[PDB]
Symmetry: C4
Subunit: 385 residues, 4 copies
């Protein structure tokens, strides 16, 4: 039976630690994939970590040059949450240098983009079987969420971007059923930029918090129907959520252009007119991580907030982060539970190695006691090489 997606997000007070894979530490000796862009997605029965391999193991010569983003060798694979991604515990999903995945209650939907920069194709699989294809419409690096798609009532939803990463691009929402595109809509969003959306379902409605790589140090959002009727905006809080970003100050409910160029994949959970913001601790680089509760931050422009929960200290590397959700049919709860993962990037460009990889940690929204701390990657670089 299908995941309803009809209930609201659980009330929460903080975030309890959920998983830590220790991947890079283990890959010093173990046969562990070089990966980036990991993400978590759950069904009605399990939770899996999905990741983009570089088709190479850590501490091996084929990990050379793995700071490079796209190659014919990158593949989407998955393993049980909290396990080190290995060729001996990993399920092959798709050939992909950009990906999304989610479960509708019946089967896994996966989305894998591969092919040339000027004509990439998204391959959609339902239960490991190809069901559809989406071809680049702007012939400039077709790219998707790098986190879980959202499912409501047997329909799953995703965002894709095509075009420049330093200017106006083109953004589309896709509605799919059983891995087939049944509807899609291009966003009429002049002056907006959408990329690497973290999307979650909330009472029949999908909310995406994305990355403005163009000219925004605050995060853009889309909220849409099962019909793809949408509203757009930026998070107004002066607690800016992108990286890089300026210091906290007066927000905008447009893009904040200081330190607006570039960015990092992130997420936020809308709670009424309040917002839980996951962001790095550093203003410039992908270092540290904290959760911030800003009770009026969705709509109000000030820089004040109620609650900081430390997750990774500034002295340690972080990276991508994304939302995932746990549905009532898995948990037995009467509400949809918010969770998040953080990718902890090690190696290039910031460190002197021949390789780039990431490990993961994850946390779930909880209505009981929690604590801040640092759960950093913990590997000592460089490696034997």
């Amino acid at each position: 039976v299908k995941l309803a997606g009809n209930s609201s997000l659980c009330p929460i007070n903080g975030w309890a630690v959920y998983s830590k894979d220790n991947s890079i530490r283990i890959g010093s000796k173990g046969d562990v994939f070089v990966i980036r862009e990991p993400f978590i997605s759950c069904s009605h029965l399990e939770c899996r970590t999905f990741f983009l391999t570089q088709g190479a193991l850590l501490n091996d010569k084929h990990s050379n040059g793995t700071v490079k983003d796209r190659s014919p060798h990158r593949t989407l694979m998955s393993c049980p949450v909290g396990e080190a991604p290995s060729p001996y515990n990993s399920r092959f999903e798709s050939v992909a240098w950009s990906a999304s995945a989610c479960h509708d209650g019946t089967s896994w939907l996966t989305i894998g983009i591969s092919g040339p920069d000027n004509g990439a194709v998204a391959v959609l699989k339902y239960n490991g079987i190809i069901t559809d294809t989406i071809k680049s419409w702007r012939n400039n690096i077709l790219r998707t969420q790098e986190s879980e798609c959202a499912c409501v009532n047997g329909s799953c939803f995703t965002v894709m971007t095509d075009g420049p990463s330093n200017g106006q691009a083109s953004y589309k929402i896709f509605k799919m059923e059983k891995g087939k595109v049944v509807k899609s809509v291009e966003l009429d969003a002049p002056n907006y930029y959408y990329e690497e959306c973290s999307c979650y379902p909330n009472a029949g409605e999908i909310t995406c918090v994305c990355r403005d790589n163009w000219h925004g140090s605050n995060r853009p959002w889309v909220s849409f129907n099962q019909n793809l009727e949408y509203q757009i905006g930026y998070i107004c809080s002066g607690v800016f959520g992108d990286n890089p970003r300026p210091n906290d100050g007066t927000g905008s409910c447009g893009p904040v252009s200081s330190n607006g160029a570039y960015g990092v994949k992130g997420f936020s959970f809308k709670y009424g007119n309040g917002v839980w913001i996951g962001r790095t601790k550093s203003t410039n680089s992908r270092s540290g991580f904290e959760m911030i509760w800003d009770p009026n931050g969705w709509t109000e422009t000030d820089s004040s907030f109620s609650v900081k929960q430390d997750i990774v200290a500034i002295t340690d590397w972080s990276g991508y982060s994304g939302s995932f959700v746990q549905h009532p049919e898995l948990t037995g709860l009467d509400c949809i539970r918010p969770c998040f993962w953080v990718e902890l990037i090690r190696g290039r460009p910031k460190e002197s190695t021949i390789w780039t990889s990431g490990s993961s940690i994850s946390f779930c929204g909880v209505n009981s006691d929690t604590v801040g701390w640092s759960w950093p990657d913990g590997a000592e670089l460089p490696f034997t090489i």
Copy 2:
């Protein structure tokens, strides 16, 4: 319930990337089998890659001399598609230096040939249990498909060859039910040569596209009943599909003798009087790969075609390729879906190593948008050794 095999091949426009195992790249550090002759076969529930190991791991001294084709140590094994063939994820199937495998909807049938050159025996297993045996009848390297057998209505079908590889040999079709031979027929095919057949079911009828190692640079074919009533011929297109081969020119609906000796395992999908040809890009060696749609190529002798889709560039090594199929009972489709795999050979004889192995990529026939590219093996040779 049994795979019907009663429906036709799906209409398609091109090929979407399905899997890439990255085996050789991973085997630089990971515990990965030295293999050749890999192939994919699906049931009603899963798809598996089958392969012939050399009973040795990559980058280990026992991989020495693995260009050699037949030994008592070669075994047929399988793992989930897209995973690197490892002793920790691989299921043992059979002792074999030549093999075939398929699923009738109930159980896996496997065929493993081992024993001496002058008296090899094919061991047939149904659900991992020995059900029959076929002894060499010409005492000269009994050999079979090195790809999936075809199943129609609880009966599975295979081709075997015995005799010289530089002259007339003897060719037999076998019909088996529950892993037992119930009927077989020797082909009355003077001047023809059949080897390494890629066979697929199409509306109750089996079509095999094979390798003429003797004197044909175009590929021979057999099409046969559930009764083993057959017709034979060669593909007429002047787009020649073997390797080695001459340049494209005037085809024959006999063997094209320039560059006819030797060959490579390949495949083709008959679509009316049209043909999808998988072939190497190079005319001499196993380099590159492309799909070609020739709308009249089954019967017409010209060298013109409609559609080239690149799969591997000439600058990269390929090798064997074969058909596999996905039945309605697995996909939910109303038609049988064509797919193919390519073996990407690395090492001897073309490169200076002590070993020979292959990785795999695969693709499925799709009626939506697709793109050409190169998805090559990607390993850097030589290895530590």
Copy 3:
């Protein structure tokens, strides 16, 4: 259906060997986790070994400094009993530097404590899903059993300690149902010290044998209701069960203060007014192991006993030991079967390595013939490093 916990402990005469993982021996070459604090827990269908990794493999640089007890990298994981804990056979459970786990007949409950020393949080998971949280109430290293919790009639029970490890601390019993705390009670135990409790169910009643780290060389005990109505005491036998301890002499039914400070996790099985004591052979260090039947030792103060069964010789290292139980619904027996495991610690502080790890052996209570022997760790130190 739920584990009843309503039957009594089986009559037994001795202990039959059950498992040996050979972990450290294998981890000399194999990819094996550095672990400590392992323990066994069974469901109605299987038995699993749980352990606290250091997020590092044996014989790798990240095993450096692993004598250290608590870090953000420590995780609770599990694998089938008797298997070497590897990233390729291990299931991720929780982020934790102190842990407990048990099965109520329906799902696995796990308890993982992580976070800072001055504010650690216990994360409770039911079926891998977070169900509750317990925050440190004395802000001084919240810590739990490091063995299985006890389940009676769909309710599971655990003990936690907070406060100093060289003085009076605070001790609480928790009753949980489906991974949620429904009741808890603080023990009014002046002059007592409770830590690392080994708890087992006996006819609807839970008995814990614990570690007095403060001033007791005999072991303290709690016995409690499904209502958390309790009685407390120390084991009276002059066969002292902690390490360190004095030589056997006149017991107390309070803490025996010679050699009372520090301690080791241990266990005992109450059989009427008799007791089966698992203890080290050495009086000072964690060396050797023996089972002792003292038919009056629960209540009587003498140092005489009936039966020594050797398990590990004094010349070999042991460490932690704990109780586990096998319920009728798993075994088909009419009684609850007592079993125990021993952790065999190797490396720091006693040996010159950069690392500390442990392997495990286990034994089950049997009413047939048994034999004493030595089943030691068997690794030769140091390692390559």
Copy 4:
């Protein structure tokens, strides 16, 4: 439902190759256990290889001295047939330096002997749970089959030996149900010696072919009821089946004393008054292997036979061999199928290594065409060490 064991052995003409694990070849690089005494046993659903590890991996320092037979570190483990025994694919069964195992249709029974030479205990497990114990009655190396036990009608049967290995010992048959001994009988066999019995069921009757280590170069046999009513004897053929042995000549229906001392574990299948003999090719050492059909060899004393099928050449090492069986409920056949495995020993004492291990090959009885060949171990010694 229980394995009946009520049908007869299938008619056969020869032996078709079934499995080859290539263990030692793979263990040169892969994480593979050092093992000896492997054996195969099947249920109604699968076939598993059982083996005695030395708690150490190949090509690691802990493999030193593994020619030694008995230690506290030896464990019984199992994996799917034809797979290399690894800590990542192996299930832990029992602590044991001598073992037996079989499946009654419901659960796995395992028998593991460990403990001191002068008081070893057999631990019986049903479904991985301890159900019984057998203590040494002669206090001189209690030892069992090192192959599968035989099951008839929910009862399983085994042979054990206690006493000297160069003189009269004591031999017992045990009948067990659900892993519990319900009956046992000591054989009144003066001048006979029984060890390492290969036992199989045939129409409600169990036949064991064993090893006379004392003074027999032909093999002893026991045939017994479900009641344990027995007959004893030696195989009369002048085709002697032990190793060492004299050249073929005039048999005895007592022990043939030339070259009678020592021996090797072997097997034979009784077919009326005929016999299929598995034996080494060499008369002195464990080299080579062949199957011999002697149509009158059970009862007649001559050295003539009808059919030699080569399995391993004299130039290659063999070792232990044993019977296993495949029951109708697994195969769908109307008869019980005979199969055998051969252990291929490498290293000490015959080769200069610090270690001893074995790989396995196996074969099944077939009523179709077969072929002789050599399927040897194939590892090149010595190793890195």
